Amino acid sequence: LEEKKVCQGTSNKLTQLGTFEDHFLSLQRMFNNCEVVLGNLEITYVQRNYDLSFLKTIQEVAGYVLIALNTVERIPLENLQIIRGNMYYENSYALAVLSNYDANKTGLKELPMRNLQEILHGAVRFSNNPALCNVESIQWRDIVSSDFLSNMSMDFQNHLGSCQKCDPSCPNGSCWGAGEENCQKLTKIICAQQCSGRCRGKSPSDCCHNQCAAGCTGPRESDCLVCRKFRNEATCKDTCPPLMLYNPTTYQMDVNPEGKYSFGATCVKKCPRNYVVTDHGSCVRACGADSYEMEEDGVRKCKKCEGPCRKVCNGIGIGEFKDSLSINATNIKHFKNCTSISGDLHILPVAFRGDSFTHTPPLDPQELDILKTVKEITGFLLIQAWPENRTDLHAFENLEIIRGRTKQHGQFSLAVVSLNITSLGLRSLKEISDGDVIISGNKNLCYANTINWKKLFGTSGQKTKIISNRGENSCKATGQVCHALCSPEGCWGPEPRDCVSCRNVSRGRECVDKCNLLEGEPREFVENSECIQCHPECLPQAMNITCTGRGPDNCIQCAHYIDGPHCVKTCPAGVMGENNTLVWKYADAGHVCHLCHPNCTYGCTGPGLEGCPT
Amino acid sequence: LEEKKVCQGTSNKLTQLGTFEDHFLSLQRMFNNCEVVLGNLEITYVQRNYDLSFLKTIQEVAGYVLIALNTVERIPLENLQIIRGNMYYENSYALAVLSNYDANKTGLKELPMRNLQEILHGAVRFSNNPALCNVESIQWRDIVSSDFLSNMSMDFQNHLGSCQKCDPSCPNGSCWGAGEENCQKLTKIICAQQCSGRCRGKSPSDCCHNQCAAGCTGPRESDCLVCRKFRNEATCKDTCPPLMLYNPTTYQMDVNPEGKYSFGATCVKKCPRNYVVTDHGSCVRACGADSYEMEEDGVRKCKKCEGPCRKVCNGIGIGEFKDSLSINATNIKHFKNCTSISGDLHILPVAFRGDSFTHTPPLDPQELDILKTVKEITGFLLIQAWPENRTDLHAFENLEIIRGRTKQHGQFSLAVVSLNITSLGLRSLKEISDGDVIISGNKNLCYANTINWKKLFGTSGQKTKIISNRGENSCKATGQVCHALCSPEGCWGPEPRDCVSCRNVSRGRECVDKCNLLEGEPREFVENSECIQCHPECLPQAMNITCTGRGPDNCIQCAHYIDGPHCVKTCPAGVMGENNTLVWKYADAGHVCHLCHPNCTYGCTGPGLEGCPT
Amino acid sequence: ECPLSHDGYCLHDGVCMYIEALDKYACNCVVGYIGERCQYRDLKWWE
Amino acid sequence: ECPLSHDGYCLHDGVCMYIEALDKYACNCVVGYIGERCQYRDLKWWE
């Protein structure tokens, strides 16, 4: 059973989404049948008499837990085991129960988290709950790490007291609520020094493994409740097994028959096809500045730089761009000569009308042309606004790959929702290596329903939501349909250059009805359905074809002279040779090029000395 | 103290090294005061009344243990704790006690290895011991690994009945010798169910760490008696701490502040000076095929191949030359175009006569010239025979570096013993990165003690042993001393080209007293004491410097023509200039060449255009 | 409600609201948009 | 004593010998030389 229903968790912090009944519905639709929250769990503005029972399934929050401004009288989190805390609230805490009361001082009353065993990182804040009961008696030093216990801030002010004490079969208090089942079970401050981590009792025969996070059911690494750092698919490892093992006997590096790549917090057999496989053995999103990606036998890798490295262009939401939430006119200058945006790309409607809260000027719609040199995006592309003047995504006409290593909402890797464009115009897009694609809500946009997106997707299980665009019959009846000479596979626009693949052949970036064989102005040949011009020194054949390749070596007949295998315009007269000896040739009867006489220094118009006079 | 005395150990399996009392001294001179054996341990052929009390200090054998053909009544291995079985006797065993009986059915009687508690690999064997007491009762499934137990071949025959019963306090009546302390301490087949490795008792609060090999005192990882794989200088891990750790959140690598380089069975702060440093953080001896070694910032590393990797050469005793013991006439071709012997070079007297045992023909002395292309040796150089006609080590006239990674007898790196050479002649040797140097027994070899070897050594601690060569009185008498045209720095022979240095000037490789700037061979000029000839057309004089540089811009005068800065035998007639403009020069009384009017491109014999004849 | 500094703080036609208990400011995102300051569209549960 | 198969098997003038108990052959190296078949000189303890 190596699967647990995961969700993404909210990051609104304090934000109310609509009304008191539209927020709850949006809360319910995310934390439903979820077992492992991959993000942050936030429970805000839950008015009285609402069934919050669906939270009895969450077993591990990988971020912080914020419970603020609620009024429901009972929040059942009876199966939460660990609050790891990879991101703090108020940049210090991991669990926080802030002002949580109704008008007449009533409000949140019980919070039975009786399975909460460890907060890996962070502190706790309990302020301004006047109706809370029994949570004032817990021993938070069994949960929080002693490294963080100096930051905690508890403030219990239940001036009502209309709630019973807890069963005497509980450690001097330490009760999460009412009854004998809802007290607290301690696993860190009872057992003896022989244990290095946590335990199951007081005997030294109970110490759990080092890598058990909450508790354990057995002394070995395959019995931890929740793993602490990694997970080797049945055990709580500390580092994924290396791919190569040192040999103390021969001073060399062997191979490991149980080596595995580290991907996130799991040890997998092989990396995902859209990640960078480092040499140590690890799936990463992008490797250090000393290297650069390199396609190799299908998988991605990166080798050391060749002298000076290239421009590493961070994307919105990584590195120096973590406070910026758009492509605002301040930071647009940094994407000046980029080719691969190693991150995301957001284009929000607050970049064009200007933000005041962060003192940024409006973005001139002409300043988007800086992106026309971007070719890869190792993430997602979220376009949420485009200048009303334009009619297609012109600044991305050179985009070629969207790796989808990090995705919007953890699901999508392309979002073109609610623009005013007529056609997409991404005519150079060839692959979306992961993540769904949503192109919907656009007022007057078609040509999007023709492309067979099952080709671009490079992973099984990719969907596409394309709804509420310009009607199918609405623009079909107005000539707005894919062009004539294009394969029915689709098109990104009406112009012949906008179609992916052609009906017959192509002249570079444009499709055509037939190559210029026999006739035409430039002679051409056909390979892989492409029309390439014959070397200029190919005599225009009005009968059959003209050439069978690019080079003058395939010319059926040379137009001027012929220097051996090649078709030349004029026989060589000054070309470097062996022993620093120059080279001079002449054209005989059949316009064939033959070498001069060893003595002829000023060249020769004929064979030997009888050819070059004074 | 902190570090324990190591010894190298025998391996001459059943060979007797001379007389009964010449073999014992060899046994004594090797294992006296030793505490950790880095190899094997042969105790063969010890007659009785030979006090073997110097063995009570050995605490760990890193190979096998062979006790065969003795007659001594007691072998005091009372402190051996672990046999790491890194190589096997008879390809199956790591402890063999064979045929230890005398002629009249007497022989070995006491083998009190009461502290032996782990044999990490290989089986045991106990045959033909009709005098051994009390060892017929040990429980060999507490010591041998549970995997290697199908190979044990242990039979005891002690019909004499003169053995001893042992104290009742021994587990299941199993003792190592007559006494109360010789009870076998059990640590594996009495472990509680919870224990993974060893246990200091039966209660489940006693299990030792996973890495403890023999036993432990405490459940920590710094309490093991002897360790299993590595040793991090106060504890012992499974693998040396990685140099760069992974990150489950950012999906990137982080610099591990507690990283260590693995070097053998230890974790060191930095690799040794002459060891290749892989990116894994591990000191190796020669890195894999896909890479090629290269220096980088003082320390030796190895980067990926530019493509197909160059000719890699193995040395004797490794690779496919595992059992070949010299440079046979059969494996001499495999060194055809080598430039780095990854391994080591042995030259034994069997090579030049040919052994009919391994069906090897006699070598031809003139076939040694194949080695003239070797420019380094990453191991050691053992020269033990050499053709008689020769006078110097002629095949090694280009050797430059001996790395001394693997060494002979664990100590020596260069060895030229018992030849008939007259002078070494390693005139290009400039480095011995490790190991000592022994040049002795060469009956007539002068110049051996004129070098200052401390400039070749690249480490502190390297000694040197030159003895019993030709005495430095018959060298001076006959006149066998190096050229007076050298410096007191050193000399590899009598010719001027045999000195590590030159007192005045060095004409390339040899030494001369003066670079001729006044007469003789084409003039030269000193720079860092060399002599570099003038440009061919510079005219010499019985006067001041002819030229102070290589280029023709430095001849004081040239007896041929000149174009301003540079002299030319005949000023150019077609050299490429700027914008196809060929330069046209002609004769002049001032000897300087001027530009004609190119309007008659046939070369001008006079100024303007009337000069080109018609 | 919110001071003149916190003006244009809420992006998608949301209204800035001031919390007097925690003494902080928060948004009131219209139905459809999510995020700290109503910056993102909810792609999963509408077009 | 050693059969014709094992001739010249001992390198440095050491006399081959046959061990009856173990049915194997071995050397009797002269003093100064070590190794399985008396191949190496003892560099450590003499010239």
- Which residue type is seen at B180? E
D interface test, pick of B357, B380, B438, B440 with most D CB neighbours within 10 Å: B357
Paired with A101 in beta bridges are: A107
Backbone angles phi, psi at A123, to 5 degrees: -120, -170
Report yes or no on B526 lying in a domain: no
- Within 8 A by CB and 6+ apart from D4, the residues are none
- Chain A residues within 8 A of B601 when measuring between CB atoms: 602
Q: Closest residue of C to A29, CA-based?
A: C45
- Which of B18, B99, B441 is opposite residue D30, by nearest beta carbon? B18
Distances (CA, A) of B56 to B33, B42, B44, B59: 9, 15, 17, 8
Q: Which chains touch A (3 or more CB pairs under 8 A)?
A: B, C
**Count of CB atoms within 10 A of residue A192's CB?**
12
- Within 8 A by CB and 6+ apart from B464, the residues are B436, B437, B438, B453
- Chain B residues within 8 A of A246 when measuring between CB atoms: 239-240, 262, 280, 282
User: B111 and B61, same structural domain?
Assistant: yes
Please check whether residue D24 touches B, CB under 8 A.
yes
Paired with B555 in beta bridges are: B547
**Contact indicator for B43, B67 with CB cutoff of 8 Å:** yes
Q: What does the alpha-carbon distance between residue A221 and residue A235 come to, in Å, rounded to a whole number?
A: 5
User: A331 and A285, same structural domain?
Assistant: no
Of residues B280, B282, B258, the one with CA closest to residue B270: B282
**Contact indicator for A78, A112 with CB cutoff of 8 Å:** yes
Q: What does the alpha-carbon distance between residue A48 and residue A30 come to, in Å, rounded to a whole number?
A: 20
- Chain A residues within 8 A of C21 when measuring between CB atoms: 69, 98-99, 128
Helix (H) / strand (E) element for A23: namely helix A20-28
Q: How does DSSP classify residue A502?
A: B
User: B248 and B106, same structural domain?
Assistant: no
Of residues A450, A440, A442, the one with CA closest to residue A493: A450
**Which tokens sit at A310?**
């290239």
Please check whether residue B153 touches A, CB under 8 A.
no
Domain with B285 in it: 244-304
**Count of CB atoms within 10 A of residue B452's CB?**
12
Q: What does the alpha-carbon distance between residue A391 and residue B515 come to, in Å, rounded to a whole number?
A: 82
- Chain A residues within 8 A of C1 when measuring between CB atoms: none
Instruction: Count CA atoms within 13 Å of residue A1 on its CB side.
Output: 2
Report yes or no on B581 lying in a domain: no
- Chain B residues within 8 A of A121 when measuring between CB atoms: none
Q: What does the alpha-carbon distance between residue D12 and residue D18 come to, in Å, rounded to a whole number?
A: 17
User: A375 and A393, same structural domain?
Assistant: yes
Q: How does DSSP classify residue B61?
A: B
- Which of B86, B229, B264 is opposite residue A251, by nearest beta carbon? B264
- Within 8 A by CB and 6+ apart from B586, the residues are B571, B593, B594, B596, B603, B604, B605, B606, B607, B611
The answer to whether A285 contacts B252, with C-beta atoms less than 8 Å apart, is: yes
Q: Mark which of B186, B215, B230 sits at the end of a domain.
A: B186
**Which tokens sit at A581?**
């000896």
The answer to whether B29 contacts D45, with C-beta atoms less than 8 Å apart, is: yes
Spell A82-118 as b/e; 16+ CB within 10 A means b.
Answer: bbbbbbbbeeebbbbbbbbbeeeeebbbbbbbbbbbb
Q: What does the alpha-carbon distance between residue A326 and residue A328 come to, in Å, rounded to a whole number?
A: 5
Report yes or no on B563 lying in a domain: no
The CATH number of residue A292's host domain is 2.10.220.10
Q: Mark which of A481, A498, A517 sits at the end of a domain.
A: A481
**Contact indicator for C37, C26 with CB cutoff of 8 Å:** no
User: A316 and A299, same structural domain?
Assistant: no
**Contact indicator for A456, A429 with CB cutoff of 8 Å:** yes
Please check whether residue A614 touches B, CB under 8 A.
yes
Q: How many angstroms away from the CA of B252 is the closest CA of chain A?
A: 6
**Contact indicator for D40, B383 with CB cutoff of 8 Å:** no
Of residues A148, A126, A131, A117, the one with CA closest to residue A66: A126
Q: Mark which of B453, B479, B505 sits at the end of a domain.
A: B479
User: B421 and B300, same structural domain?
Assistant: no
User: B405 and B378, same structural domain?
Assistant: yes
Distances (CA, A) of B240 to A68, B219, B225, B262: 47, 21, 19, 6
Backbone angles phi, psi at B476, to 5 degrees: -70, -35
Of residues A414, A348, A409, the one with CA closest to residue A380: A414
The number of domains in chain B is 4
User: A338 and A292, same structural domain?
Assistant: no
User: B165 and B101, same structural domain?
Assistant: yes
Distances (CA, A) of A585 to A594, A595, B531, B575: 5, 4, 46, 20
User: B170 and B34, same structural domain?
Assistant: yes
**Which tokens sit at B606?**
């006079």
Distances (CA, A) of B226 to B202, B235, B315: 21, 10, 34
Backbone angles phi, psi at A213, to 5 degrees: -95, -60
What dihedral angle (degrees, nearest 10) is formed by the CA atoms of B495, B501, B504, B507? 60
Of residues B19, B24, B20, the one with CA closest to residue B43: B24
**Contact indicator for A315, A327 with CB cutoff of 8 Å:** no
User: B464 and B324, same structural domain?
Assistant: yes
**Which tokens sit at A423?**
């056609």
The number of domains in chain D is 1
Q: How many angstroms away from the CA of A534 is the closest CA of chain B?
A: 30
Q: Where would I find the beta strands (DSSP E) of B516-568?
A: 524-525, 532-533, 562-563, 566-567
Please check whether residue C15 touches A, CB under 8 A.
no
Q: What does the alpha-carbon distance between residue A203 and residue A441 come to, in Å, rounded to a whole number?
A: 64
Report yes or no on B546 lying in a domain: no
Q: Where would I find the beta strands (DSSP E) of B15-58?
A: 36-37, 41-42
Where do we find the tokens 């004499």?
A: B160
User: B134 and B159, same structural domain?
Assistant: yes
Q: How many angstroms away from the CA of D18 is the closest CA of chain B?
A: 11
Of residues A89, A171, A101, the one with CA closest to residue A133: A101
**Residue D39 — left, alpha, or beta (φ > 0 → left; ψ -120 to 50 → alpha)?**
alpha
Chains C and A are touching, with contact defined as 3 or more CB–CB pairs separated by less than 8 Å = yes
**Which tokens sit at B321?**
């030359």
- Which of A220, A265, A286 is opposite residue B196, by nearest beta carbon? A220
Long-range contacts of D26-31 (CB under 8 A, 24+ apart): D26/B13, D26/B14, D26/B15, D26/B16, D27/B12, D27/B15, D27/B16, D28/B15, D28/B16, D28/B18, D29/B12, D29/B15, D29/B16, D29/B17, D29/B18, D30/B18, D31/B17, D31/B18, D31/B19, D31/B22
The CATH number of residue A382's host domain is 3.80.20.20
Instruction: Count CA atoms within 13 Å of residue A68 on its CB side.
Output: 22
Please check whether residue B149 touches A, CB under 8 A.
no
Q: What is the resolution of this structure in A?
A: 3.3
Domain with D18 in it: 1-47
- Within 8 A by CB and 6+ apart from B374, the residues are B335, B338, B339, B340, B341, B396, B398, B399
How big is chain C by its Cα radius of gyration, in Å?
12
- Which of D11, D29, D35 is opposite residue B16, by nearest beta carbon? D29
